Each structure stands twice: as structure tokens, then as C-alpha cells.
Design a protein around this ligand. Sequence first.
Ligand code: 65X
Length: 134
Amino acid sequence: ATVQQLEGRWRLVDSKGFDEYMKELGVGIALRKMGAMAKPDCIITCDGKNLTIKTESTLKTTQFSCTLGEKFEETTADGRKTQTVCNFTDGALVQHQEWDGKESTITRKLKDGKLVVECVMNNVTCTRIYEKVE
Ligand SMILES: Clc1ccc2nc(N3CCCCC3)c(-c3nnn[nH]3)c(-c3ccccc3)c2c1
């Protein structure tokens, strides 16, 4: 498994726990309704250790870029400014966010040809499945 195997455009096809995760993050009702009903594509590109992830939907589009292993300021979809680091470890892309004494982890992995995205904060979890799109 390598980080390049995650590259491409991926379309959300299933979600569990996302509203509960947004509630744990402190996200207000307007953004939570958006996130409940948006059907995003995620576009992952990686050039060596340079990673970009763009999330596109009719309701909201976000994008960040980073160098694997390097701490950077990420503005999240809900507007947090976190100290984030992304690494490819044990066959998964692991994204660690820290802000205001809080922390959340997001993992992305390839399983059966689908992109499986899992998030957690304070044991509140989400699982989102994306299928590869042309
Ligand atoms: Cl308001 C809000 C708050 C938190 C969010 N966390 C997200 N992530 C979950 C998957 C791992 C990366 C983080 C995503 C998201 N990113 N890619 N897919 N969903 C969204 C989001 C963005 C645009 C359209 C629909 C949903 C989002 C929106």
C-alpha cells in the first residue's frame, strides 16, 4: 500500500456518524445541515510528499495542501484553524488536527477499491465510504 493508491476523484456513497461528529466539533446548525445533505467528491493528488485534498460539492468546496510529515495551518470546512499533520503510515493516510487543546484524527484508506474515510474526536466516530469516479 502506498499514498499514490489514494489518488483520484472519489464520490461519497455512504455515511455513518457524521452528524454526531460535527456536533462533537461544535459545528452550528447551518453548517451541520449543509454537511448532512452535501454529496461531496474528494479529489486526492500526491506528488512525492506533496499532498492536496480538495472536497467539492454544490453546497461547499474546500481544499488544503501540505507536505507529508510537516505541521501546517489548516482551515477546516467548519472554519477551525488547526495545526495539522498528514502522514502515510501502516497503509493509511493519517491526518491529525490540534486546536484549542482539542484533537481529532481522520484516516483514509483503500479497501475493496473504495476509499474509506474515518474520523474521531473524543471517541465520537464517523465512517464515510467513497467510490472511485472518472
Ligand atoms: Cl461543516 C463541515 C464540518 C466538518 C467536515 N468534515 C469533513 N470531513 C469528513 C471526512 C474526512 C475529512 C473531514 C467533510 C468532508 N470532507 N470530505 N468529505 N466530507 C466536510 C464536508 C465538506 C464539504 C461538503 C460536505 C462535507 C465537513 C463539513
